Design an enzyme around this catalytic site. Structure first.
Site, PDB file in Angstrom:
ATOM      1  N   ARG A  49      34.539  19.083  45.426  1.00  0.00           N
ATOM      2  CA  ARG A  49      33.996  20.393  45.096  1.00  0.00           C
ATOM      3  C   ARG A  49      32.742  20.623  45.932  1.00  0.00           C
ATOM      4  NH1 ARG A  49      33.041  19.896  38.887  1.00  0.00           N
ATOM      5  NH2 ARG A  49      34.011  17.832  39.169  1.00  0.00           N
ATOM      6  N   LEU A  69      38.152  24.776  43.290  1.00  0.00           N
ATOM      7  CA  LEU A  69      39.487  24.916  42.723  1.00  0.00           C
ATOM      8  C   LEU A  69      39.528  26.000  41.647  1.00  0.00           C
ATOM      9  CD1 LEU A  69      40.823  21.266  42.380  1.00  0.00           C
ATOM     10  CD2 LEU A  69      41.254  22.943  44.177  1.00  0.00           C
ATOM     11  N   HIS A 114      35.010   4.829  29.761  1.00  0.00           N
ATOM     12  CA  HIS A 114      35.013   4.036  30.972  1.00  0.00           C
ATOM     13  C   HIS A 114      35.764   2.733  30.694  1.00  0.00           C
ATOM     14  CE1 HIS A 114      32.452   6.686  33.146  1.00  0.00           C
ATOM     15  NE2 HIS A 114      31.799   6.876  32.018  1.00  0.00           N
ATOM     16  N   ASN A 132      35.553   0.675  27.555  1.00  0.00           N
ATOM     17  CA  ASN A 132      36.192   1.221  26.364  1.00  0.00           C
ATOM     18  C   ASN A 132      37.707   0.969  26.343  1.00  0.00           C
ATOM     19  OD1 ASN A 132      34.010   3.581  27.324  1.00  0.00           O
ATOM     20  ND2 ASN A 132      33.754   2.737  25.264  1.00  0.00           N
ATOM     21  N   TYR A 133      38.389   1.161  27.484  1.00  0.00           N
ATOM     22  CA  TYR A 133      39.855   1.047  27.507  1.00  0.00           C
ATOM     23  C   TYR A 133      40.254  -0.388  27.173  1.00  0.00           C
ATOM     24  CZ  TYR A 133      38.782   5.474  29.928  1.00  0.00           C
ATOM     25  OH  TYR A 133      38.208   6.672  30.279  1.00  0.00           O
ATOM     26  N   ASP A 179      39.759  -0.237  35.343  1.00  0.00           N
ATOM     27  CA  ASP A 179      39.785   0.705  36.439  1.00  0.00           C
ATOM     28  C   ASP A 179      40.764   0.253  37.521  1.00  0.00           C
ATOM     29  OD1 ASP A 179      37.786   2.247  35.281  1.00  0.00           O
ATOM     30  OD2 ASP A 179      36.253   1.821  36.807  1.00  0.00           O
TER      31      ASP A 179
HETATM   32  C1  LIG Z   1      33.261   1.923  35.297  1.00  0.00           C
HETATM   33  C2  LIG Z   1      33.362   3.441  35.459  1.00  0.00           C
HETATM   34  C3  LIG Z   1      34.794   3.943  35.161  1.00  0.00           C
HETATM   35  O1  LIG Z   1      35.392   3.424  34.208  1.00  0.00           O
HETATM   36  S1  LIG Z   1      35.503   5.286  36.124  1.00  0.00           S
HETATM   37  C4  LIG Z   1      36.837   5.775  34.977  1.00  0.00           C
HETATM   38  C5  LIG Z   1      36.396   6.911  34.029  1.00  0.00           C
HETATM   39  N1  LIG Z   1      37.486   7.369  33.185  1.00  0.00           N
HETATM   40  C6  LIG Z   1      38.464   8.109  33.719  1.00  0.00           C
HETATM   41  O2  LIG Z   1      38.443   8.434  34.910  1.00  0.00           O
HETATM   42  C7  LIG Z   1      39.584   8.551  32.806  1.00  0.00           C
HETATM   43  C8  LIG Z   1      40.013   9.995  33.030  1.00  0.00           C
HETATM   44  N2  LIG Z   1      38.882  10.901  33.195  1.00  0.00           N
HETATM   45  C9  LIG Z   1      38.028  11.173  32.208  1.00  0.00           C
HETATM   46  O3  LIG Z   1      38.149  10.750  31.048  1.00  0.00           O
HETATM   47  C10 LIG Z   1      36.919  12.142  32.584  1.00  0.00           C
HETATM   48  O4  LIG Z   1      37.238  12.690  33.863  1.00  0.00           O
HETATM   49  C11 LIG Z   1      35.483  11.532  32.544  1.00  0.00           C
HETATM   50  C12 LIG Z   1      35.321  10.395  33.566  1.00  0.00           C
HETATM   51  C13 LIG Z   1      35.206  11.036  31.118  1.00  0.00           C
HETATM   52  C14 LIG Z   1      34.437  12.632  32.856  1.00  0.00           C
HETATM   53  O5  LIG Z   1      34.677  13.844  32.040  1.00  0.00           O
HETATM   54  P1  LIG Z   1      34.184  15.292  32.564  1.00  0.00           P
HETATM   55  O6  LIG Z   1      33.088  15.207  33.549  1.00  0.00           O
HETATM   56  O7  LIG Z   1      34.107  16.089  31.319  1.00  0.00           O
HETATM   57  O8  LIG Z   1      35.357  15.839  33.500  1.00  0.00           O
HETATM   58  P2  LIG Z   1      36.839  16.206  33.098  1.00  0.00           P
HETATM   59  O9  LIG Z   1      37.842  15.292  33.694  1.00  0.00           O
HETATM   60  O10 LIG Z   1      37.033  16.428  31.650  1.00  0.00           O
HETATM   61  O11 LIG Z   1      36.998  17.596  33.881  1.00  0.00           O
HETATM   62  C15 LIG Z   1      35.988  17.986  34.849  1.00  0.00           C
HETATM   63  C16 LIG Z   1      36.641  18.957  35.792  1.00  0.00           C
HETATM   64  O12 LIG Z   1      35.718  19.391  36.810  1.00  0.00           O
HETATM   65  C17 LIG Z   1      36.317  20.570  37.354  1.00  0.00           C
HETATM   66  N3  LIG Z   1      36.661  20.364  38.757  1.00  0.00           N
HETATM   67  C18 LIG Z   1      37.336  19.316  39.328  1.00  0.00           C
HETATM   68  N4  LIG Z   1      37.498  19.438  40.621  1.00  0.00           N
HETATM   69  C19 LIG Z   1      36.911  20.656  40.919  1.00  0.00           C
HETATM   70  C20 LIG Z   1      36.756  21.360  42.125  1.00  0.00           C
HETATM   71  N5  LIG Z   1      37.212  20.935  43.297  1.00  0.00           N
HETATM   72  N6  LIG Z   1      36.109  22.550  42.074  1.00  0.00           N
HETATM   73  C21 LIG Z   1      35.659  22.991  40.893  1.00  0.00           C
HETATM   74  N7  LIG Z   1      35.755  22.421  39.698  1.00  0.00           N
HETATM   75  C22 LIG Z   1      36.396  21.241  39.778  1.00  0.00           C
HETATM   76  C23 LIG Z   1      37.610  20.859  36.592  1.00  0.00           C
HETATM   77  O13 LIG Z   1      37.877  22.241  36.624  1.00  0.00           O
HETATM   78  C24 LIG Z   1      37.230  20.262  35.244  1.00  0.00           C
HETATM   79  O14 LIG Z   1      36.293  21.127  34.598  1.00  0.00           O
HETATM   80  P3  LIG Z   1      36.439  21.854  33.138  1.00  0.00           P
HETATM   81  O15 LIG Z   1      37.282  23.110  33.225  1.00  0.00           O
HETATM   82  O16 LIG Z   1      37.251  21.135  32.101  1.00  0.00           O
HETATM   83  O17 LIG Z   1      34.952  22.006  32.839  1.00  0.00           O
HETATM   84  C25 LIG Z   1      32.719   4.068  36.692  1.00  0.00           C
HETATM   85  C26 LIG Z   1      33.158   3.908  38.000  1.00  0.00           C
HETATM   86  C27 LIG Z   1      32.497   4.555  39.040  1.00  0.00           C
HETATM   87  C28 LIG Z   1      31.386   5.353  38.804  1.00  0.00           C
HETATM   88  C29 LIG Z   1      30.959   5.510  37.508  1.00  0.00           C
HETATM   89  O18 LIG Z   1      29.892   6.268  37.032  1.00  0.00           O
HETATM   90  C30 LIG Z   1      29.008   7.162  37.629  1.00  0.00           C
HETATM   91  C31 LIG Z   1      28.806   8.370  36.982  1.00  0.00           C
HETATM   92  C32 LIG Z   1      27.901   9.271  37.522  1.00  0.00           C
HETATM   93  C33 LIG Z   1      27.206   8.962  38.675  1.00  0.00           C
HETATM   94  C34 LIG Z   1      27.410   7.741  39.295  1.00  0.00           C
HETATM   95  C35 LIG Z   1      28.307   6.820  38.770  1.00  0.00           C
HETATM   96  C36 LIG Z   1      31.614   4.883  36.468  1.00  0.00           C
END
Ligand code: A1IY9
Ligand code: A1IY9
Lengths: 358, 357
Positions: B38, B59, B124, B127-128, B154
């Site tokens: 994005r 998107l 994350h 949790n799983y 992951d």
């Molecule tokens: C160790 C650690 C890991 O375990 S990584 C594994 C994390 N779990 C998963 O991946 C499972 C599936 N996903 C989710 O459960 C969620 O994705 C979420 C991660 C909880 C975030 O939830 P959230 O931010 O609410 O996002 P969402 O999925 O519900 O939907 C967001 C969407 O954004 C919008 N949009 C997407 N692409 C675009 C685009 N191109 N343009 C515009 N908008 C876009 C969608 O529309 C949607 O938005 P909505 O309509 O619903 O608002 C791990 C590994 C690595 C890094 C890490 O942590 C960090 C975190 C932050 C910073 C640095 C590191 C953690």
């Protein structure tokens, strides 16, 4: 035979650990898997549930007859899996070059720890040895103690069998263009290194240290760790993103005003002490109620024996029963060509009967 | 493009953890990988974004979606790792994609799965693996469980099952002419990843007690030991003859020791092995046991791995930018992967489209 690998024919030279785990998954997804064991270990119907979705056959590969029967199966198959030291298949006459003469479409899949060459290539080893050499084991466990092995999850399976599977399936895709098979060299020391590519990335950019127990994802962050509850059981906290962390604090009864900043690492001792005392004041299942349906990233740490009672596990059928024990259902899942429930280990079969069928 | 997956086209909707890891391995093996991020986001310094082209696109706009569906029409696989329902509301769901390309492999990477009570919960890795028995089994018995980084949910039970699914579905497509949807949930993958423990529990060979098992660190012959210099070795001498070899190299007479597998005396056996390993430094044991089947190896920190002969000689790593990175795995005799291309600045999504007709 149900699943997306229906049609696929697989020969597995019986080994231990990654080799059979790979074979199981191919089975799980519809492949026709034939396991050649040695009769030296014959017996009745095996109790190792890892040998599901198999036909088992015996064959002294050291004999001329054994070798030739084996070579007929390979001739008629898409994949061979072997997980013996380098040189074992060569000296048996089942090496890649010998297989390429009776079937140049074969995917020749070589599962080892150390690789096919180099100084350690003849050393015996297990999971713990392979992950010791590439930095992984050293990174697992508390900071005040020696490293602890993550069972045999990271070397044998995540970095072993699974890279074998990807190599096999990548090579089957290749064979659609070229009409030829090839050799897949899957070493646990390499696969597990790619499994932890993220840490190698973060390390490069100053975001991961070699100090055990002092990083974002190893237990050093108070918001990514387990906590002991009042009953001596545990929850997991994974509240990395500030919105989720805020949700967690609200559920714990802690006001953000009274705590140090979430990512002020210098005050992580205080923060941990605060979260520790809060989680310790009620029992695991309390926290489980409080936080269900929440984005607080707080979950109960269930023991194997309790998993079968967890609603989300039950409803998606993550497990099935088979002989006084649950077992995992195939993964991943497919919309149109669904896997079916695994068939248990079948009593042995005749290597001829199989060549017939095929 | 070098590797067995030359000519595979993959569209990746940017997320964190497993989806990017799978996309990387696909790239690694010579797939054409286009990652839509994005605009709210030059060159990305996460080496996990190697072997990609990066494009931006809102998107949510009409034109971002249109462009996106024009990529997906041209591709073989789509990867998305958002919560369920998300791609649907963008108009990039499996049904919208099947209209523009009924051959697409539609690859959904989640933790909890596509449906059920926890399907909308954030989470994350930790949790799983908490829910399915895995996390409880990891760590010492006198302490709370320790996360095995994010290796098991992951990656091992996550990205790698997405890959097995993407590639098995490609095989199936060859005989059916049709794509389909791959639902890879980390709570499922990681359960299959640990099938060996479930097999062992069923036959009474594994307990739910932490630190009391063959492979969890409770066995004195499968554990790490601290050496005279404060560094560590790993012992994995399960088979009795490997075990015997280890005892001889430690200077220990097997007659003095309890049985290898008398579990009631493991505490006592561990105390004898602890004292032996403590009496010399790690590199001493590394030498002593080289070319041995004793299953004793030095436990290297990340920063020492570039100095280990077996690592150097097999080129398990390449130098990149800041430091070393793992070379592609696994390895291929005929169509060999090449060294990963670094993360390369944003290009315009139209450029890609002309490149793909
Ligand atoms: C160790 C650690 C890991 O375990 S990584 C594994 C994390 N779990 C998963 O991946 C499972 C599936 N996903 C989710 O459960 C969620 O994705 C979420 C991660 C909880 C975030 O939830 P959230 O931010 O609410 O996002 P969402 O999925 O519900 O939907 C967001 C969407 O954004 C919008 N949009 C997407 N692409 C675009 C685009 N191109 N343009 C515009 N908008 C876009 C969608 O529309 C949607 O938005 P909505 O309509 O619903 O608002 C791990 C590994 C690595 C890094 C890490 O942590 C960090 C975190 C932050 C910073 C640095 C590191 C953690
Ligand atoms: C957590 C743990 C794990 O990590 S899993 C294993 C990890 N390592 C690997 O798999 C890497 C590659 N493999 C090897 O490095 C070796 O296999 C070896 C296992 C080290 C030692 O094996 P060794 O006994 O020396 O065998 P070898 O491979 O060099 O050669 C054996 C050959 O046997 C002969 N023949 C094979 N098939 C036949 C046949 N059908 N008929 C006749 N002969 C056959 C060959 O001739 C050759 O013998 P040679 O000629 O040289 O004499 C782990 C996981 C799972 C289980 C486990 O242990 C348990 C055991 C019981 C219960 C529970 C767990 C440990």
């Amino acid at each position: 035979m149900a699943g997306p690998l229906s049609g696929l024919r697989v020969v597995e030279l019986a080994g231990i650990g990654p080799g059979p785990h790979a074979a199981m998954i191919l089975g799980d997804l519809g492949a026709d898997v034939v396991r050649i064991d040695r009769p030296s270990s014959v017996d009745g119907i095996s109790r190792d549930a890892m040998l599901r979705n198999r036909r088992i056959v015996t064959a002294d590969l050291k004999s001329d007859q054994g070798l030739e029967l084996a070579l007929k199966l390979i001739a008629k198959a898409d994949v061979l899996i072997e997980g013996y030291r380098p040189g074992v298949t060569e000296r048996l006459g089942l090496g890649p070059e010998e297989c390429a003469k009776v079937n140049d479409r074969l995917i020749y899949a070589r599962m080892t720890g150390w690789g096919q060459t180099g100084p350690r290539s003849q050393q015996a080893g297990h999971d713990i040895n392979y992950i010791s050499l590439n930095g992984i084991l050293h990174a697992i466990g508390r900071g005040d103690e020696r490293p602890v092995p993550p069972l045999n999850l990271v070397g044998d399976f995540g970095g072993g069998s699974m890279f074998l599977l990807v190599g096999i399936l990548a090579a089957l895709w290749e064979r659609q263009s070229s009409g030829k098979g090839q050799v897949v060299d899957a070493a646990m020391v390499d696969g597990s290194s790619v499994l932890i590519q993220m840490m190698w990335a973060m390390r490069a950019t100053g975001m991961w240290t070699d100090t055990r127990g002092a990083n974002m994802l190893d237990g050093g962050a108070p918001y990514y760790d387990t906590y002991e509850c009042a009953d001596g059981r545990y929850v997991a906290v994974g509240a990395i993103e500030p919105q989720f962390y805020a949700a967690m604090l609200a559920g714990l009864g802690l006001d953000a005003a009274e705590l140090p900043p979430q990512n002020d690492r210098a005050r992580w001792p205080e923060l941990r002490a605060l979260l520790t005392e809060a989680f310790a004041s009620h029992d695991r299942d309390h926290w489980g109620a409080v936080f269900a349906n929440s984005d607080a990233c707080v979950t109960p740490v269930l023991a194997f024996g309790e998993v079968h009672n967890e609603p989300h596990i039950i409803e998606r059928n993550t497990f099935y029963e088979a002989n006084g024990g649950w077992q995992p259902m195939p993964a991943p899942r497919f919309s149109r060509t669904a896997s079916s429930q695994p068939r248990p280990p079948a009593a042995t079969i005749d290597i001829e009967a199989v060549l017939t069928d095929w």
